[PDB]
Amino acid sequence: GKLPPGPRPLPLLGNLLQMDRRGLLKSFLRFREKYGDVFTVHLGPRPVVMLCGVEAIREALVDKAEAFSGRGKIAMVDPFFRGYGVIFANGNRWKVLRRFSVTTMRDFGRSVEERIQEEAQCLIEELRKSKGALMDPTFLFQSITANIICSIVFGKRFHYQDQEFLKMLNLFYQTFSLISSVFGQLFELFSGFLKHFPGAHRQVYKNLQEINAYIGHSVEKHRETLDPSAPRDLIDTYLLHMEKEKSNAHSEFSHQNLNLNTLSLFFAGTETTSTTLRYGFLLMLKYPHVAERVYREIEQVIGPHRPPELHDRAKMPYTEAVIYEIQRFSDLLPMGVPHIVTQHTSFRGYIIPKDTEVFLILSTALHDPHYFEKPDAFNPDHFLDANGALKKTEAFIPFSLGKRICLGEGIARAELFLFFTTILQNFSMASPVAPEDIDLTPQECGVGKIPPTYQIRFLPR
Ligand code: HEM
Ligand SMILES: OC[C@H]1O[C@H](O[C@H]2[C@H](O)[C@@H](O)[C@H](OCCCCCC3CCCCC3)O[C@@H]2CO)[C@H](O)[C@@H](O)[C@@H]1O
Numbered sequence: 209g210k211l212p213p214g215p216r217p218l219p220l221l222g223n224l225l226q227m228d229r230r231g232l233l234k235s236f237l238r239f240r241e242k243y244g245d246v247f248t249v250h251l252g253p254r255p256v257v258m259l260c261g262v263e264a265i266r267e268a269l270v271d272k273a274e275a276f277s278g279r280g281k282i283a284m285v286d287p288f289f290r291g292y293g294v295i296f297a298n299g300n301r302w303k304v305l306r307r308f309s310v311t312t313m314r315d316f317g318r319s320v321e322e323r324i325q326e327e328a329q330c331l332i333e334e335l336r337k338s339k340g341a342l343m344d345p346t347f348l349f350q351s352i353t354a355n356i357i358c359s360i361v362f363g364k365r366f367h368y369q370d371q372e373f374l375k376m377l378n379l380f381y382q383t384f385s386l387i388s389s390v391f392g393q394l395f396e397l398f399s400g401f402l403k404h405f406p407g408a409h410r411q412v413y414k415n416l417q418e419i420n421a422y423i424g425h426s427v428e429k430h431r432e433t434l435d436p437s438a439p440r441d442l443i444d445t446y447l448l449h450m451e452k453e454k455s456n457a458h459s460e461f462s463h464q465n466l467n468l469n470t471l472s473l474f475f476a477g478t479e480t481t482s483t484t485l486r487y488g489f490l491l492m493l494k495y496p497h498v499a500e501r502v503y504r505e506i507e508q509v510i511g512p513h514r515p516p517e518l519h520d521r522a523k524m525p526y527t528e529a530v531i532y533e534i535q536r537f538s539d540l541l542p543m544g545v546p547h548i549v550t551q552h553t554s555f556r557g558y559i560i561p562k563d564t565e566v567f568l569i570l571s572t573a574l575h576d577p578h579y580f581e582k583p584d585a586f587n588p589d590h591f592l593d594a595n596g597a598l599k600k601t602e603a604f605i606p607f608s609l610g611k612r613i614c615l616g617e618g619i620a621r622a623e624l625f626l627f628f629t630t631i632l633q634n635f636s637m638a639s640p641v642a643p644e645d646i647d648l649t650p651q652e653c654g655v656g657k658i659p660p661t662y663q664i665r666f667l668p669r
C-alpha cells in the first residue's frame with residue numbers, strides 16, 4: 209500500500225552505499241536477489257521502481273498501459289532533449305509525434321526492403337574493395353544503418369568515403385559510449401550536483417549540438433526547395449504539417465520538435481542496430497561453427513548469387529534463431545528506456561504514485577532461465593525446437609512492449625536479417641584473435657551495453 213520494498217536510503221545519497229561498483233544493472237540484480245522482481249531504489253534524491261522478469265514487465269506495460277506509458281529522463285541527455293522529439297516526449301506531444309513518425313516511417317518506406325537491399329550491395333562492394341584488410345567494422349555498420357534512416361528522413365544516402373558523414377557517425381558512437389560509461393551512470397544519481405563540474409555530460413551535450421547543427425541546415429535547404437505537391441521525405445512532410453497548423457501558437461509541429469525528433473530518429477535508427485551488428489560479428493568470430501552453419505543455410509536456401517530478400521526469412525529458421533540470439537545475448541538496452549507512471553497506480557498491492565520513474569529491466573527477461581537454459585551463453589538453440597524449427601518466446605522483448613514499444617522494430621529486424629545474410633553470403637570472417645581468446649565482456653554497460661572494439665577481415669568466398 210506504499211512503494212515497493214527495497215534497501216533503506218540515506219538522505220542525499222539515496223542508496224549509493226548499497227550499490228555495486230560494477231554499475232547500475234549489477235546493483236539492481238543484487239537487489240532483486242533480496243527483494244524479488246518489484247522493488248524501489250533511491251537514485252540520489254528520488255525513488256525509482258524496478259520491474260524485473262517478463263511477467264511483471266508485461267503486466268505493467270501491456271495490462272496497465274494507462275498508467276505505465278510515460279517517459280522518464282536520462283540525466284546525461286535531458287539537458288539537450290528537454291522533452292522534445294518522440295523518444296523523450298510525454299502527453300499530447302508524444303501522441304502527435306509518435307503518430308507522425310510511425311505514418312511517415314511507413315509511407316516513405318521505395319519500399320524499405322529495397323533500400324536495405326541496395327545498401328547491402330553497396331556494402332558488399334565496399335568490403336570487396338577492402339581486399340580482406342583488418343578493420344574495426346563499427347563505421348560501416350553505422351553507415352549502413354544510418355543510410356536507411358537517411359533515405360527516409362533526408363531523401364538521400366551518404367557515401368562511405370564522405371569524411372563529414374563519418375564525422376557525424378563518430379559523434380553517435382562516442383556519445384552512446386559516454387552515456388553508458390560509469391560517469392554517465394553516476395550522473396543519473398547525482399546530476400543535481402555533478403552538472404556544475406566539468407565532465408562527460410558537457411561532452412555529450414556538445415556532440416548532440418554538433419549533430420543538430422546539420423539537421424537545422426538540412427531543414428533550411430528543404431524549406432527552400434519544398435514543393436507542397438510532392439514532398440520528398442519525412443522532413444518535407446513535417447514542414448507541410450507545420451504550414452497547415454501555423455495559426456496555432458501551440459502546434460506541436462514546431463522547429464524544436466522538428467530538429468530533435470529528427471535527431472531522435474537518426475540516433476536511434478543508427479546506433480542501436482549498428483551496435484547489435486558489432487556484437488553479432490564478434491560472436492561469429494568467437495563461434496565460427498555458427499557462422500559456418502548460417503552460411504550452409506544461405507547456400508541451400510538462397511544460393512551464392514541472388515540477393516537475400518525478406519521472403520527468405522520463413523525458410524531460414526537457423527539464421528533467424530542466430531539473429532534472435534545475437535539480440536538476446538547482446539542485450540542492447542539492459543534497463544530499457546526509463547518510464548514514468550502517469551497516474552497513481554496500484555501494482556501487486558503497492559501504490560506507485562503519479563510521476564514516479566519506472567525502469568523495466570528488459571535484461572532480466574532476456575536472461576530468464578525458465579525460458580533460456582544457460583542464459584549467460586551464446587547459443588542459437590535458445591530459439592530452435594527439437595526439429596530445428598524456429599521457436600519464438602514471449603521472454604524475447606529487447607524492443608520492450610506496450611505504447612512506447614520501439615517504433616523501429618520492423619525496420620531493425622529487416623536490417624539485421626538482410627545485412628547479416630548478405631554479408632555472410634559473400635564473405636567469411638577471420639581475425640588475429642583465436643576464438644577461445646575472444647573476450648565478449650562489454651566495453652561499457654549502462655543505458656547501453658556496448659561491445660569491445662575488435663579487428664576483423666571479411667574474406668571473399
Ligand atoms: C536492434 C535495434 C533496436 C533495439 C534493440 C531497440 C530498442 C528499443 C527500446 C528497448 C526502446 C524503449 C521502449 C520503451 O520505452 O519501453 C526503443 C524506443 C525507440 N526506438 Fe528502438 N531499438 C532498435 C532500433 C530502432 C530503429 C532502427 C529505430 C528507428 C528507425 C528506432 C526508433 C525508436 C524510437 C523512436 C523509440 C521511442 C519510442 C517511443 O518513445 O514512443 N529503434 N527502442
Ligand atoms: O550549424 C553551425 C555549424 O555548421 C557548420 O557545419 C557544417 C560542415 O561544414 C559540414 O561539412 C557538415 O556536413 C555534415 C554532412 C553529413 C551529415 C550526416 C548526418 C547523418 C545522420 C544524423 C545527422 C547528420 O555539417 C555542419 C553543419 O551544417 C560547421 O560545422 C560548424 O561551425 C557550425 O558549428
Ligand SMILES: CC1(C)[C@H]2CC[C@]1(C)CC2
Nearest residue numbers: 295384387475476479545
Ligand atoms: C538516447 C539513446 C541512447 C539513443 C539510443 C538509445 C537511447 C536511450 C534512445 C536513443
